Write a protein that holds these residues in place. Structure first.
Motif, short mmCIF file in Angstrom:
data_model
loop_
_atom_site.label_atom_id
_atom_site.label_comp_id
_atom_site.label_asym_id
_atom_site.label_seq_id
_atom_site.Cartn_x
_atom_site.Cartn_y
_atom_site.Cartn_z
N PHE A 46 4.28 -39.74 -31.13
CA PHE A 46 3.81 -38.58 -31.20
C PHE A 46 2.82 -38.11 -30.02
O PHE A 46 2.80 -36.98 -29.43
CB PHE A 46 3.21 -38.12 -32.49
CG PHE A 46 2.43 -36.84 -32.57
CD1 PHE A 46 3.22 -35.52 -32.47
CD2 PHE A 46 1.10 -36.51 -32.41
CE1 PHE A 46 2.60 -34.22 -32.70
CE2 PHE A 46 0.49 -35.15 -32.32
CZ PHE A 46 1.26 -34.18 -32.37
N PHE A 47 1.70 -38.92 -30.01
CA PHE A 47 0.64 -38.68 -29.02
C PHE A 47 1.23 -38.85 -27.57
O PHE A 47 0.77 -38.13 -26.68
CB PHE A 47 -0.43 -39.46 -29.21
CG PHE A 47 -1.40 -39.00 -30.45
CD1 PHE A 47 -1.90 -37.66 -30.56
CD2 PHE A 47 -1.10 -39.44 -31.65
CE1 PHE A 47 -2.43 -37.21 -31.51
CE2 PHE A 47 -1.96 -38.86 -33.07
CZ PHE A 47 -2.49 -37.72 -32.63
N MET A 68 -3.98 -46.03 -28.93
CA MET A 68 -4.38 -44.78 -28.43
C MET A 68 -4.94 -44.59 -26.99
O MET A 68 -4.81 -43.84 -26.15
CB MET A 68 -5.22 -43.60 -29.12
CG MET A 68 -4.38 -43.43 -30.63
SD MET A 68 -3.16 -42.58 -30.62
CE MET A 68 -1.79 -43.97 -30.69
N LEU A 89 9.63 -34.80 -35.85
CA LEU A 89 9.14 -34.48 -34.70
C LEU A 89 10.14 -33.88 -33.68
O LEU A 89 9.95 -32.87 -32.80
CB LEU A 89 8.48 -35.63 -33.81
CG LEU A 89 7.98 -35.71 -32.27
CD1 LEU A 89 6.82 -34.54 -32.34
CD2 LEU A 89 7.39 -36.73 -31.94
N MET A 118 4.44 -47.51 -38.66
CA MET A 118 3.92 -46.16 -38.29
C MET A 118 3.14 -45.97 -37.19
O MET A 118 3.43 -44.89 -36.30
CB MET A 118 3.40 -45.46 -39.59
CG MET A 118 4.04 -45.48 -40.65
SD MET A 118 5.75 -44.62 -40.54
CE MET A 118 6.50 -44.98 -42.21
N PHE A 168 3.75 -51.29 -43.23
CA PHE A 168 3.79 -49.91 -42.97
C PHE A 168 2.96 -49.44 -41.76
O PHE A 168 3.56 -48.67 -41.01
CB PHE A 168 2.92 -49.37 -44.56
CG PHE A 168 3.02 -47.82 -44.40
CD1 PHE A 168 2.08 -47.02 -43.80
CD2 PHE A 168 4.07 -47.07 -45.18
CE1 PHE A 168 1.89 -45.75 -43.80
CE2 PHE A 168 3.87 -45.71 -45.14
CZ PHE A 168 2.91 -44.97 -44.45
N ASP A 169 1.41 -49.99 -41.62
CA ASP A 169 0.97 -49.64 -40.65
C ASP A 169 1.55 -49.94 -39.41
O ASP A 169 1.44 -49.28 -38.49
CB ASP A 169 -0.55 -50.40 -40.67
CG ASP A 169 -1.20 -49.85 -41.87
OD1 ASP A 169 -1.10 -48.64 -42.44
OD2 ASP A 169 -2.26 -50.51 -42.37
N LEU A 213 5.81 -43.46 -35.45
CA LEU A 213 5.31 -42.14 -35.44
C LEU A 213 4.10 -41.86 -34.79
O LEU A 213 4.13 -40.96 -33.98
CB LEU A 213 4.90 -41.84 -36.88
CG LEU A 213 6.13 -41.77 -37.97
CD1 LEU A 213 5.45 -41.51 -39.33
CD2 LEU A 213 7.32 -40.84 -37.25
N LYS A 214 2.84 -42.75 -34.78
CA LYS A 214 1.71 -42.27 -34.31
C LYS A 214 1.81 -42.17 -32.47
O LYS A 214 1.60 -41.27 -31.82
CB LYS A 214 0.45 -43.11 -34.46
CG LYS A 214 -0.85 -42.52 -34.13
CD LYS A 214 -1.86 -43.23 -35.02
CE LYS A 214 -3.54 -42.65 -34.71
NZ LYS A 214 -4.35 -43.28 -35.27
N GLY A 267 11.14 -39.42 -40.17
CA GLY A 267 9.81 -38.87 -39.49
C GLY A 267 9.98 -38.50 -38.05
O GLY A 267 9.52 -37.25 -37.63
N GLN A 306 3.11 -35.39 -27.08
CA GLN A 306 1.97 -34.50 -26.95
C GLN A 306 1.60 -34.32 -25.52
O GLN A 306 1.57 -33.04 -24.96
CB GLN A 306 0.88 -34.67 -27.98
CG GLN A 306 -0.08 -33.72 -27.72
CD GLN A 306 -1.56 -34.15 -28.93
OE1 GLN A 306 -1.91 -35.00 -28.85
NE2 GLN A 306 -1.69 -33.17 -29.48
#
Ligand SMILES: NC(=O)c1ccc[n+]([C@@H]2O[C@H](COP(=O)([O-])OP(=O)(O)OC[C@H]3O[C@@H](n4cnc5c(N)ncnc54)[C@H](OP(=O)(O)O)[C@@H]3O)[C@@H](O)[C@H]2O)c1
Ligand SMILES: NC(=O)c1ccc[n+]([C@@H]2O[C@H](COP(=O)([O-])OP(=O)(O)OC[C@H]3O[C@@H](n4cnc5c(N)ncnc54)[C@H](OP(=O)(O)O)[C@@H]3O)[C@@H](O)[C@H]2O)c1
Ligand SMILES: NC(=O)c1ccc[n+]([C@@H]2O[C@H](COP(=O)([O-])OP(=O)(O)OC[C@H]3O[C@@H](n4cnc5c(N)ncnc54)[C@H](OP(=O)(O)O)[C@@H]3O)[C@@H](O)[C@H]2O)c1
Ligand SMILES: NC(=O)c1ccc[n+]([C@@H]2O[C@H](COP(=O)([O-])OP(=O)(O)OC[C@H]3O[C@@H](n4cnc5c(N)ncnc54)[C@H](OP(=O)(O)O)[C@@H]3O)[C@@H](O)[C@H]2O)c1
Ligand SMILES: C[C@@H](O)[C@@H](O)c1cnc2nc(N)[nH]c(=O)c2n1
Lengths: 240, 240, 240, 240
Positions: free
Chosen positions: A121-122, A69, A167, A113, A109-110, A117-118, A163, A125
């Motif tokens: 998305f951000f 992030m 979005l 994603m 998995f982590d 996805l994470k 997923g 955004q």
């Protein structure tokens, strides 16, 4: 000047999209892009950056891991402070961890994603916010045929790609009110580093990165009145 | 040379596709197409033919009503006897009868189905047989966003377009085994004679036929290894 | 005995499904289930357990958080160690964080995905392994209409539900090879604690938990030869 | 009294639906159904009529071929004159013509479309008018998994089923405004006269008509606030 940000620009499809935009500008006078290229490997960015400048395109390289992030924040801040405007975001960065259902781990998995996805998305955004204020912009999402079809060793990959489509579809609702275009590119097998090995006979049954890049750039060059909402590409013989 | 058959080439999208192929061959030296143009109006065919010849493309006009099985036979025979080979079939011919559910007539039904479903199916059946033997070929189906989404005044139109998609999906099963490419073009509102009158909005809220023609020709020009299976295009503001 | 594990059994849909299975055991004597009920609130489980027992069914409560990998392992081992097999898994546990695109946080994202995608995936991975060995079993996934349609304040919720559908579709590939049934329940608005608030007006435009529970239980009671793959339910007046 | 019209009530799925409705009235003392049974064979109707009356249901037989517009008119007239009200329409009547793409005929096409699309459309058009005025009603469409998936020998069948789905989706737009419920039942292989032959092993990998009828009747018995929009059912082993 058209300000474009392409993630995962160091290899495969992302790299091909960067080069196609550079080449398109060399033949489309009215089109003068600034190619902001990003990926996790500086060395890759330096090489593709050089190749794009060789075509006459302006470039700006920024090393960033969208799964972090902090880097998503840096990317956003870079666009805001250095350009204050964004015309195109190509959400190409993505990873894949494949295997039998029973062999997939929490790490698989982590890892999948956090990027697919994470980070996606951000980053979306943050940059859509600018496009919303501009009442102009184009966002491309490189999802996959795996966003609508399942494959045995792709349980986690499919969760992440279906997923991403979720979005994409939500963004269409926001975009139609702000004059922003949303394109969902869904390719089947493309010969890139994501596959690693790949026998000679297998390569012949795959598409090439440039095959995907051409339609992406053409979609961006469409007049603002029209949006290529979806483009599905596959090897002529079908999925492997 | 490439033998292409474009139905409904007299106006709208079909005409735009014919012209785009002509222009493509003009700037893409190595692509010499023979544009077989068909429509129900000889007058329209002569006009579009001249425009294409102005671009330096070879043309061959033939009047045919695909809702008439006799004309479907005449069209197929023409390709078999005069060329005995077909590289691209663009199933663009189509009609639309709209109105409130309670007002649609048996005639609206037959008129729509005889062209959109029956004519399209039998022409495809006959010409695909040639491509199957050739182990090469590309078929484009101009369906609609109405092939996957319903609209109140389009009960019959949607039945026919969803129906076309059913054909498209079945053709993919056959095509993948004989090196044939299948492309399903799904456009939203396009300003063409099919709509009739327009004004402030409408036109300003619609795409133009050339916006659809561009990606169609680009998909055909893709290397044989790759097939653009689907292309969905809409006005940036969405359906109206 | 039919061993059923129902996650999110303490409230809303999960609670209704638990009660409906209990009632079915009373009306259909040939069906003898052990209802293993799980959620994050002990007192919730005690109450629903008592209610199911009032119907004459056997129950076993276990407080667990499926977003905690240790609890996923605890839930799985409990089933294996206490019963030795599992006949039905109802992946109902789920959460929803809603808001305008610009208002959603990293915590909204993590909280949603940790349960909706991560917990759901690993619990499914573990219990399907058992069913695969038994060559029998039924897995229900309570996704949502939001798994195929987007909503303005559901960017993250939709990513998670589209994501769940991705898992569902992959599971079908594995399930068909070992006599396991996969059911994807997709409800529209259902009056449950997930919505909080109220208003007799909007409440009248929603479905009730029992409306979703009925079809779920009926699907499980179908002969093993048949699988109700998908069930989509909505308020008669459509989405709100 | 509930007035329900079931087309294709003499054999297979239609017959099973009629019987299940009759049997369901036993657990619902306030549910008194009048089963209007229709098909092309009077002999079949007498048989199912007797079986239904033996279950305690009121019946009314009417021989009609929905591919003949004159019969659609008389069928509609019957409902209007005898009852002047219709609570449920089960559009089950349907036909199938299969074969390799190259072997299908114009007659295969016409025969399939005249019933699956034409008769179905005009019967729906006429009776929905009654429901719209009543501001109540439920229409079931028995389509197929072939309405969303293609099969090699189902080019014409799929065009007709994808087509039926197009009508279903348009009906939803009208239905949501007048309190009418629309249910799309999509089954995979079901052992019925439609298949003709058998082989025990083959029949062992198929669903039975009663498996389809159960969910249909339960969907009708849901409270008016809730509509089971779609029910997809397949043999647990998948498509054959
Ligand atoms: N290849 C196919 O067959 C295929 C098919 C359908 C869809 N796709 C999708 O197309 C996109 C590109 O795939 P590809 O085949 O080109 O993959 P690739 O050859 O492995 O290249 C991936 C690029 O994305 C970058 N990237 C990945 N994760 C990142 C992160 N967290 N932060 C920043 N950059 C990141 C990589 O950077 P580093 O190498 O420096 O780490 C690299 O530059 C992905 O979304 C993939 O899922 C691929
Ligand atoms: N326009 C839109 O907004 C839109 C959107 C989505 C999909 N589409 C589809 O795109 C295709 C073309 O639409 P359009 O807007 O270009 O329509 P258009 O402007 O009315 O042109 C239709 C063309 O098809 C020909 N044609 C129609 N029926 C025929 C038949 N039975 N036999 C031979 N030729 C026939 C017409 O010939 P004649 O004029 O000589 O009779 C004309 O050349 C159709 O399939 C349409 O459904 C259009
Ligand atoms: N309600 C609707 O309108 C609607 C529509 C479509 C789909 N759905 C889906 O239906 C499912 C149930 O929704 P609902 O409306 O019944 O929600 P609800 O009323 O809030 O109840 C949710 C249940 O799931 C449990 N749960 C949630 N996360 C959990 C976790 N990590 N570990 C263990 N248990 C957990 C909750 O336990 P605690 O309360 O003890 O924390 C509670 O028992 C969800 O997947 C939801 O997305 C709901
Ligand atoms: N069976 C499967 O595997 C399967 C799978 C998916 C969907 N479906 C669909 O389910 C529905 C019923 O199939 P089924 O297997 O029950 O077929 P079936 O066993 O052959 O029975 C068909 C029924 O429909 C009636 N019918 C057909 N055409 C008619 C017409 N033009 N006018 C009036 N009645 C007509 C037949 O009457 P007559 O016998 O007197 O002519 C018969 O009563 C159809 O829509 C079919 O496509 C079936
Ligand atoms: C659709 C799916 O095949 C495509 O997204 C994709 C991309 N990269 C991949 N990479 C590997 N290694 N294996 C795959 O199956 C794969 N698959």
């Amino acid at each position: 000047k058209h300000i474009l940000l392409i993630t995962g620009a160091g290899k495969g499809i992302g790299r091909a999209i960067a080069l196609e935009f550079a080449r398109a500008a060399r033949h489309h006078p009215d089109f003068e892009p600034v190619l902001v290229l990003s990926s996790r490997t500086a060395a890759d960015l330096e090489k593709i950056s050089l190749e794009c400048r060789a075509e006459g395109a302006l470039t700006d390289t920024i090393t960033a891991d969208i799964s972090d992030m902090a880097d998503v924040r840096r990317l956003t801040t870079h666009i805001v402070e250095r350009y204050g405007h964004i015309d195109c975001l190509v959400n190409n960065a993505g990873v894949g961890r494949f295997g039998a259902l029973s062999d997939l781990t929490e790490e698989d998995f982590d890892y999948t994603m956090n990027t697919n996805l994470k980070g996606t998305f951000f980053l979306t955004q943050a940059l859509f916010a600018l496009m919303e204020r501009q009442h102009s912009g184009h966002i491309f999402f490189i999802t996959s045929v795996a966003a609508t079809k399942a494959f045995r060793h792709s349980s986690i990959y499919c969760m992440s790609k279906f997923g991403q489509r979720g979005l994409v579809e939500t963004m269409r609702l926001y975009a139609r009110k702000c004059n922003v275009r949303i394109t969902d590119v869904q390719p089947g097998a493309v010969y890139t580093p994501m596959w690693g090995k790949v026998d000679d006979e297998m390569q012949a049954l795959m598409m090439m990165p440039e095959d995907i890049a051409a339609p992406v750039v053409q979609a961006y060059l469409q007049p603002s009145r029209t949006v290529v909402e979806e483009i599905i590409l596959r090897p002529t013989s079908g999925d492997i």
